[PDB]
Design a protein around this ligand. Structure first.
Ligand SMILES: *[C@@H]1O[C@H](CO)[C@@H](O)[C@H](O)[C@H]1NC(C)=O
Ligand SMILES: *[C@@H]1O[C@H](CO)[C@@H](O)[C@H](O)[C@H]1NC(C)=O
Ligand SMILES: C[As](C)(=O)[O-]
Ligand SMILES: C[As](C)(=O)[O-]
Lengths: 344, 344
């Protein structure tokens, strides 16, 4: 059977035979290519899949990239303005799946220029960087990332610029100084400690601090990181912890029976640490959906080249009590942590 | 213990008991009063402090004031000649601490007469005004200002006539026109923009312009003033930026641990601006001395009545990277900016 000619999102999709991909130029909003696949169900009936705009980039986002390029050849002040623009641009919900992938690139350029120019972002710059991130990973865009990641591992890439930005910020803090950044979909703590006199255990997130969003306060997620873990494998440890509310929905998934059903915690430390062989990291993580079963604590390294495969690691962590909408994990090496489970 | 009779600078200082001030008539050069304090060290030994000539005014400077007064009761041409005379007089290094304080008054009379008579100073008049200023604030006179400012806030007063003179000049420029004035100890930019169509961001100082002194070219000080800041709280903005090389040595100091260790940038704008709540002003400032620590960016309002107190403001500005003999600041409201630090 065949999918018939449709008009959708200002584009005509010519009749197509089951199993072939049709391509069209992106809407005049943008440039690139759009695609739609003529699928065949089980009963033998052909039906149109959804159209993909992963390779479409709104002119607005291209213009913002070119300005970014103007500033590079005062650079820092330029990147401050790029992120101001990007956030304003994203808030308008005028972007295709491919504009998200292009935003990750812009954030990398911004983050790489800040490091290259030794330009410490302002306080409002940090908050705005992570508010951009919060927009991008909002569940509202769960289907756009599903479409974006068929062409490029946008989440692997985003977590890596986030890691670079965290340590750009943390590298400017004073010894024993910390900072908290709260957004709709992330909470971030950046902490700096001397390698030879790490002051205390690291816990996170500190709910007592007024400013903490509700979804964290009325929650059970927490990190306990014993100071005994912060040991060397430059003169300061930058410790960053990120609790993503929704990121689990778009990460490389685990083997089929299971699924990322929890909030996600990243714990990055530079320089590299030699963790003890005993699992000494406590990671408690709330669930994204009521009704799960068979929890498996896991860690997943977005730094590896095969990061997009989704090789989750269930031997790093030990799964302990599951209760009150969360599960506790006891993990050995630092990484990105989640509770894999069978969804309803 | 007592300080014994000394003869110094053509004056006899009678024996004095520790802690009392002795007074003498000024040298015959001048009129007024000189003073010297019999101090007591920690060990209990009395010793003469230095003599103060803050209240002495050389006859030469009094004669120049009386001529100033002749011209006022053709006035403008008179004030042109006063500044010609003052500069010639200052260049001769024949002045007491009190002649400096008297020069500030003369510059106010000159500046007030120019405004009162709507007499736009010539190009050579502007340059000569600021060359007078450069002489006066040269570090050579760092001890004279220390002596002058025990009786009158000469620097608060000088910065205010400078502000009045800048806006007298700037009020005569054409729209979008600018001017640069370079001296040994200051660099001044005066810029005029329409309130409703401010053309671009203001940066300063533009080192590319040949004519720029060396101490600025081989330096890192800079202002970035986004056009977004120039918003109203008459039909034109006069924007003046002054980078003082040495002024930090004689401004009201901060709390004891810290000290004005940097070059100083004033940024005046008339009419008054309503700045955004986000800190959008970038101020980079070089250090006056190698060896500082613990930098704190600060702003200080010489317009307030308590200006002489030295209420520096460290919440206006955010201190960012410190590197290559300067420190970057990100400030919210326009003012006079410096980097306070612990000196060696
Ligand atoms: C921006 O980042 C992208 C992706 O990381 C890279 O391909 C591109 O070369 C960068 N552009 C600039 C101007 O640095
Ligand atoms: C000159 O200025 C001084 C100080 O501002 C003031 O006291 C004096 O009255 C002025 N003299 C004239 C003639 O305007
Ligand atoms: C520094 As990491 C979170 O990639 O182990
Ligand atoms: C016009 As101003 C330098 O006193 O803020």
């Amino acid at each position: 059977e065949m999918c018939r000619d449709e008009y959708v999102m200002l584009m005509t999709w010519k009749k197509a035979a089951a199993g072939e991909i049709i391509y069209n130029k992106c809407p005049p909003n943008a440039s690139g290519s759009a695609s739609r696949r003529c699928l065949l169900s089980a009963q033998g009936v052909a039906y149109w899949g959804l159209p993909s705009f992963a390779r479409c980039i709104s002119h607005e986002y291209r213009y913002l990239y070119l300005s970014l390029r103007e500033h590079l050849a005062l650079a820092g002040e330029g990147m401050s303005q790029v992120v101001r623009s990007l956030q304003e641009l994203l808030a308008r919900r005028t972007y295709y799946s491919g504009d998200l992938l292009f935003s990750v690139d812009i954030l990398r350029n911004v983050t790489d220029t800040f490091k290259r120019a030794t330009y410490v972002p302002s306080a409002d710059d940090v908050q705005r960087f992570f508010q951009v991130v919060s927009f991008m990973v909002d569940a509202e865009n769960k289907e756009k990332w599903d479409d974006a990641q068929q062409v490029s591992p946008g989440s692997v890439h985003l977590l890596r610029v986030v890691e670079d930005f965290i340590h750009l910020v943390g590298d400017a803090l004073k010894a024993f100084q910390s900072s908290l950044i709260v957004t709709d979909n992330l909470v971030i703590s950046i902490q700096r400690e001397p390698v030879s006199a790490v002051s205390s255990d690291i816990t996170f997130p500190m709910r007592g601090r007024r400013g903490m969003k509700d979804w964290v306060r009325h929650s059970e997620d927490r990190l306990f990181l014993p100071k005994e873990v912060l040991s060397l494998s430059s003169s300061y440890f930058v410790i960053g912890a990120v609790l993503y509310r929704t990121l689990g929905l778009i990460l490389p998934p685990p083997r089929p029976p299971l699924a990322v059903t929890s909030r996600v915690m990243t714990v990055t430390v530079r320089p590299p640490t030699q963790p003890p062989a005993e699992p000494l990291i406590t990671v408690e993580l709330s669930y994204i959906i009521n009704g799960t079963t068979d929890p498996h604590c896991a860690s997943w390294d977005y730094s590896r080249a095969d990061a997009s495969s989704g090789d989750w690691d269930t031997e790093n962590c030990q799964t302990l009590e599951t209760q009150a909408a969360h599960t506790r994990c006891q993990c050995q090496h630092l990484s990105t942590f989640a509770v894999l489970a069978q969804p309803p």
